[PDB]
Swiss-Prot record:
One of its GO terms (cellular component) is serine protease inhibitor complex. Binds 1 Ca(2+) ion per subunit. Its cofactor is Ca(2+). Substrate binds at D171, S172, Q174, G175, S177. Is inhibited by scorpion cyclotide trypsin inhibitor TopI1. Pfam families: Trypsin. SUPFAM superfamilies: Trypsin-like serine proteases. The gene is PRSS1. Its EC number is 3.4.21.4. GO terms for biological process: digestion; proteolysis. This is Serine protease 1. Disulfide bonds join C7-C137, C25-C41, C109-C210, C116-C183, C148-C162, C173-C197. Belongs to the peptidase S1 family. The keyword Signal applies.
Length: 223
């Protein structure tokens, strides 16, 4: 995340780190047994780490559980990143406490202008590589579709929305993929792609979760 701040140890209690020997993506806990992340984060051999603050230091409040299965959205297109969402089931249930909590799924989509909180352990430099070890946060509004589509012509579908600042300066960045975008207490987005990080007129693009609630609910209930 670039132009963001240190959230604080466990202040985004629904934030997860996907690890396959190292941290490679973020995710959101939706209930004791399931995590939602980006389909482009699909890997075989995932370990989910909950209650994480510093990914390189075991400070006692962590839970490391292996994934029992992964379900990529049936219509995921790796070329356009359209329908970039995946569900991960935990082999054992997470013990929910003050530091490990689930986030709610939306009942309706959020309007442009709404302020959201984007978090993760990604790169913090636009022009440079600096990978932080503690969680970073960024408060950013949802942009109108018009400004999102002018920045990426022919690339935005109805399953994506942009958030950030057009001036640039603030944005999600690689590493952060699969992480949450929460607005008014609901998980409204998943970090999906962007043009580099924090550039001017290049906001981040997020998977629009409100369009997949029935698929999420139906799939978790059947698996
Ligand atoms: Ca840790
Ligand atoms: Cl992340
Ligand atoms: Zn990351
Ligand atoms: Zn990515």
């Amino acid at each position: 995340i670039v132009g963001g701040y240190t959230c604080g140890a466990n202040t985004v209690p629904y934030q997860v780190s996907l690890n396959s020997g190292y941290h490679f993506c973020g995710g959101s806990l939706i209930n004791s047994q399931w995590v939602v992340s980006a389909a482009h984060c699909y890997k075989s051999g995932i370990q989910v780490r909950l209650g994480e603050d510093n990914i390189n230091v075991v400070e006692g409040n962590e839970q490391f559980i292996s994934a029992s299965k992964s379900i990529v959205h049936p219509s995921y297109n790796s070329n356009t990143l359209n329908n970039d969402i995946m569900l991960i089931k935990l082999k054992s249930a997470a013990s929910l406490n003050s530091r490990v909590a689930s986030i709610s799924l939306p009942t309706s989509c959020a309007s442009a202008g709404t302020q959201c909180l984007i978090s993760g352990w990604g790169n913090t430099k636009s022009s440079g590589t600096s990978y932080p070890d503690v969680l970073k946060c960024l408060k950013a509004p949802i942009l109108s579709d018009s400004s999102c589509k002018s920045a990426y012509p022919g690339q935005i579908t109805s399953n994506m929305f942009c958030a950030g600042y057009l001036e640039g300066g603030k944005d999600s960045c690689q590493g952060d993929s699969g992480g949450p975008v929460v607005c008014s207490g609901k998980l409204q987005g998943i970090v999906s792609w962007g043009s580099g990080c924090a550039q001017k007129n290049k906001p981040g693009v997020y998977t629009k979760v409100c369009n997949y609630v029935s698929w999420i609910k139906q799939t978790i209930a059947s698996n």
